[PDB]
Structures are given as C-alpha cells and as structure tokens.
C-alpha cells in the first residue's frame, strides 16, 4: 500500500460518491464464500458498476474519513465489516430493498448489514422507498 | 472438356490405390478397437496404457480421419468441378483448382506417411560401394555403377561429397564412400543397398565371352552427430596412413586415409577428406557409428520387425538388381520393374525403381 497519499484517494472517490448520492446501503463479507464472491462481483460489474464498489475500509479513522460531508451519523458504522453503496442514478433507489433481496436470494451469511442513515433508517429492511 | 477433370479421374484412381495401400478396411476396423478399449473403466487406473491407447488413437486419427477427409472431400471436389463446367462460374472454375490440389497435398501428406519415414530417412546419408572379383571387369562395374549414382544425385540436386575413394588397379575402384547432402537423402537411397549384378560381353577378352560381374552398394544414414548411445571404446583402432599418389588432380588433394575398425562384429570405415588427421578421424567415427547403427536396425528385422517368420528367413535382399547390357534389360528382383533403356538408367533414370522399392520399403 502506501502512506496518506494513496490512502486518501479511495476516500476522495467516496467524496465523489457523496457529491450527489443518497441512501448508502452496506453489506458484510467477513466470511463470504466463492458464491458470495461470485454474486458480489458479477452483480457489481453488471448492475451499475459505479456505486457498487465494495469499500470495506470501515476503520473508525478510514470510513469515518469518508463521511465528514454527508450524514456524520454514519461514523457509528465503523466495526463489523461495512462496505458502503450509495445510488448515483436514482436518489434512494432499489439498492436498500435489493441487498435485503440479496440476503433473500443467496446472501444468508452477511450478518452486519444495516444500510446507512442518509434517509435516516437502518437495520429493518424497507419498501416504502422508491425502488 | 477439362484436363483438370482428367487429373481428378487420375487422382481418384490413385486414391483407390492409396486406399489399396493402407488396407482401408482394417484401418476402420482397428480404430474402433482403440475406441472400445478406452471405454474400459481402468483407463485412469492404467495410466501408461492410457497414454498409449491415446497414442494408438492419435496416430490412427491422423490417418483414418484424413482417409475420410479424402473421401468426403473428393466427392465435393467431384461436385464443384462438374457444377462449374455446367454453369460456367469463373470463380467456381478458379476455386476447384485449389480444391483439387489440396487433396493432392493430403495425398502428399500420405506420401511421406506411406513412405513411413522414421529414424533418419529425412536426413542425409552415405554411400558405400564395393567391387567384386575377377580383376578389371569388377572395377569397371564398380566405376560405372558409382559414376551413375554420382550423375544421379546431381540431376535431383543432392550435393555430393566423395568421403573416400580407393581405386583398384585399372580404371575403377575397389571401395568408395560418398556423402549425399539433401532433404530425405537417405529416404530416396536407403532401399538401394544390396548386390548389383552386371552381365555383359567383356571388352577385355579376345572374341566374346559374356562375363557376369558383381558389385554391392551400401547406404547408411547420418546419425545426427550422435545416436545418444555411445559404444565407442570397443577395441578401438587407428591406422592413419598415406594413400595412392595424389597424381595431378587425384581425389581431394589429400591422400591421407584414416582407417578405423570396430573389431567386434567387424566394421571398417575410412575417411579421405583432409590433411588434418584429427578432422578425418572425427568424421570417420561419425560414419563408423552410423554403420554400427544400421547393424542395430538389421537385428530388429532379424527377429520380428519386418521379416514375417513363416517357414524360414523370408528375405535375403542381396541380389536386388540385374543389369544385362547386351540384352538391354534391367530387372529389379524385389518388384519386377523392368526397363529397356540402359543408358537412361546409366544416366540416372532410377525413379522407376525407387517407387518399386518404396512399395516394399
């Protein structure tokens, strides 16, 4: 890796994601198998590819560094592997109900996923949001 | 009217001969036998057999499938030409020329396969011709046969190098050795080894008295500088000595022979290229191993390679040619191909006997 030089550019790209995004939703691949990988890669390359980066750099000085600009309450979601995913084309899109559907498809073991508080909601999966 | 179709007729009948060579029935019978034995559940349990069963398979698949490729291919080329003549499509005339030739290029692929060129048949070789008995009559036949072979390879383009030439006494040699540099040079010459009979009215006796002279020729290849099995020590013997006279423009301007023997089994080779003794003995031991190499291949034929022990030793290809000059009848005793042109085959028109020897060799 490198020093702050390379360490910030990944965060700056997250700064580029919070420029116009809303409803960050997260997952947890702490134990993720081959098919848990095969899903999260083949879906990520074919769904949108822009916001579905698995940014699991969830240290309390690394992911907290991702959010000093939009919803600083997201600094609470440091531990228990967290990989943010906002939605760029659709503000508060289907990717809140989709990951819950991903957990209802194959992702049984991802036991730390909650989704972030951009629209001020967590753990309990929701459907009254525009999918 | 199309002479190309007259060649399609010629190639098809030749294809019937190409099928007549390989026993095309038994080709398809044996190929299915390799198939049935691979169904066997112990293919992975018999590893060495599995690589071998695939080897028996792959060697025939390059032949049987090609034989079937020539089958369905020729029937379409039989279609593409007749459709072209009856419809006058200029490109179809142009394409059928390439369609016929490629089948011949497959016949050419079978040509080397029918020749079954293995070990050193695609390599250069050496000649070895010995004179018989009876004074001058034998050495003339040594000469006239050798200088026929020398004029032979020049027409075919093979480079010739007299490794050694030992003149007998009066116009002829007693032994000679010539290097024939060329592609498949051993392949066009291997089958010529044996004794060659000469029958003529001798010019040496008053009156007449048709004399029968004998002389043999031996063709051994180049063994790729090393066989990978060196049987060198083997009671080695060096004898390097001066030769006849270097008179005027005598052979190679060397007169420095290197007589080397291989005492067990009695193999004798010699070299007369250069003055450098260390250079000639290096080159002579190369052909000594090659002459020892042909001895190793004859032993396989002596057991069960290509003799077919049925009643007795089926072979003895010693008398392979008969050259009757005063009757103008050259007969090969291995195929029966005859020719009524002495001076043509004394110039080197030996292709008729090569194909005759290609059949049984």
């Amino acid at each position: 890796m490198a020093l702050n030089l390379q360490d910030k550019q990944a965060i700056v790209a997250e700064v580029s994601e919070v420029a116009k995004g809303a409803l960050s939703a997260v997952v947890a691949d702490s134990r993720g198998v081959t098919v848990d990988k095969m899903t999260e890669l083949r879906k990520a390359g074919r769904e949108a590819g822009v916001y579905m980066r698995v940014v699991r750099n969830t240290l309390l000085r690394r992911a907290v560094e991702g959010t000093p600009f939009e919803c600083l309450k997201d600094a609470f979601v440091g531990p228990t592997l967290i990989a943010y995913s906002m939605e760029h084309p659709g503000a508060a899109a289907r990717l809140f109900k989709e990951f819950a559907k991903a957990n209802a498809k194959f992702e049984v073991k991802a036991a730390a996923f909650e989704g972030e508080l951009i629209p001020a909601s967590q753990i309990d999966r929701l459907a009254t949001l525009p999918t | 009217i199309n002479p190309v179709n007259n060649r399609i007729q010629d190639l098809t009948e030749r294809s019937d001969v190409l099928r007549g060579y390989l026993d095309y029935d038994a080709k398809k019978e044996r190929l299915e036998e390799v198939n049935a034995e691979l169904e066997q559940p112990d293919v992975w349990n018999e590893p060495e057999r599995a690589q071998a069963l695939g080897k028996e398979r792959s060697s025939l698949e390059a032949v049987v499938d090609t034989l079937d490729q020539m089958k369905q291919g020729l029937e379409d080329v039989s279609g593409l030409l007749e459709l072209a003549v009856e419809a006058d499509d200029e490109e179809t005339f142009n394409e059928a020329v390439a369609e016929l030739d490629a089948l011949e290029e497959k016949l050419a692929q079978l040509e080397f396969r029918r020749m079954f060129s293995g070990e050193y048949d695609s390599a250069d070789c050496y000649l070895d011709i010995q004179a018989g008995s009876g004074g001058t009559e034998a050495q003339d036949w040594a000469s006239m046969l050798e200088r026929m072979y020398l004029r032979w390879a020049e027409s075919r383009g093979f480079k010739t190098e007299i490794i050694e030439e030992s003149e007998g006494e009066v116009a002829g040699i007693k032994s000679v050795t010539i290097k024939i540099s060329g592609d498949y040079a051993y392949g066009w010459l291997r089958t010529e080894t044996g004794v060659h009979r000469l029958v003529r009215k001798s010019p040496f006796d008053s009156g007449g008295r048709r004399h029968t002279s004998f002389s043999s020729a031996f063709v051994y290849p180049e063994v790729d500088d090393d066989i990978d099995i060196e049987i060198n020590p083997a009671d080695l013997r060096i004898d390097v000595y001066r030769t006849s006279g270097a008179g005027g423009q005598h052979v190679n301007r060397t007169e420095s022979a290197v007589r080397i023997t291989h005492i067990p089994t009695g193999i004798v080779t010699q070299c007369q290229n250069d003055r450098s003794q260390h250079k000639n003995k290096d080159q002579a031991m190369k052909q000594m191993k090659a002459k020892l190499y042909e001895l190793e291949m004859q032993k396989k034929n002596a057991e069960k390679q290509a003799m077919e022990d049925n009643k007795s030793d089926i072979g003895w290809g010693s008398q392979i040619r008969s050259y009757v000059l005063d009757d103008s009848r050259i007969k090969d005793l291995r195929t029966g191909v005859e020719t009524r042109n002495t001076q043509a085959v004394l110039d080197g028109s030996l292709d008729q006997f090569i194909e005759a020897s290609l059949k049984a060799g």
């Binding site: 083949r42 390359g45 074919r46 590819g49 | 198939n35 691979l38 169904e39 559940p41 293919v43 992975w44």
Partner: protein, 141 residues
C-alpha cells in the same frame, strides 16, 4: 434438491457428441449414461451452428438429474475463424498471424458477453485484444 454433486465442463465440438470415444472417461467417473449425454447436447445443438468449438457446463444432482448449460466459443479459436488462419504464436511478436478490425472485434465482444460476463463492450474488446496480442495476432481498428 441441492446445488451440485458432480460439476464438470467439456465438449470441444458443436455437432460432434460422441460419448465414449473422447468423453468416455469424463462420463463414468461422473455417473453419466452415454446415450443420455449423447442426446442431451443433441437436444440443444440443433439450433446453433454445428461443427464449431462450443463448450458446456454440467451439474449433477443427488437424485441423478443432469442440467447442461452451453457457453461461448473461446477467443483463440473464434478469432482463428474470424481471421481464417490456423496458427498460434511459437514466438510472441515473431510468429504473426493477421489483422482483425475493431469492427470485427465489436461483433465478437458483444457476443462473448452474450454467453459470458462483462461490464463494457470495449473492456471486453480489450480483453479479447489482450488475448489477441497473447496469441501472436496483430490487431487493427
């Protein structure tokens, strides 16, 4: 029932099935009947071009149920058919084959991502061109 019991991938041909001769070892070690495997591909290959190289994916269930899935032909052989020159690369940039236009590459990459996965047609084109430069194939636009 469940996911897989015997997972393989075979069939280097498009119209030639032949259970026992080339596939025979990979059938008996996988619990596969020969004629069933001989006809299951024939139950699929009639609609697609035959004689070409098209692979397969086999999954076996615990109740002996064979589900077969076809894939796309490889890059090295389809481009060998797109160029028509049966050659590879003995030496990297010494044994050269022939040129392929990006327009020829565009139809391929859109088809290679039709049976397989990718994100961008040009990114798949670079992957093909990546394998193309790896096969001693000269590539043009």
């Amino acid at each position: 029932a469940k996911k897989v019991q015997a997972y393989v991938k075979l069939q280097v041909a498009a119209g030639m099935a032949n259970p026992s001769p080339p596939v025979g070892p990979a059938l008996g070690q996988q619990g596969v009947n020969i004629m069933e495997f001989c006809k299951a591909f024939n139950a699929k290959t009639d609609s697609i071009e035959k004689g070409l190289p098209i692979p397969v994916v086999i999954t076996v269930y615990a109740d002996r149920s064979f589900t077969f899935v076809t894939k796309t032909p490889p890059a090295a052989v389809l481009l060998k058919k797109a160029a028509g020159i049966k050659s590879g690369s003995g030496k990297p940039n010494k044994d050269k084959v022939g040129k392929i236009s990006r327009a020829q590459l565009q139809e391929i990459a859109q088809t290679k991502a039709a049976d397989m996965t990718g994100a961008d047609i040009e990114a798949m084109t670079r992957s093909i061109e990546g394998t193309a430069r790896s096969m001693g194939l000269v590539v043009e636009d």
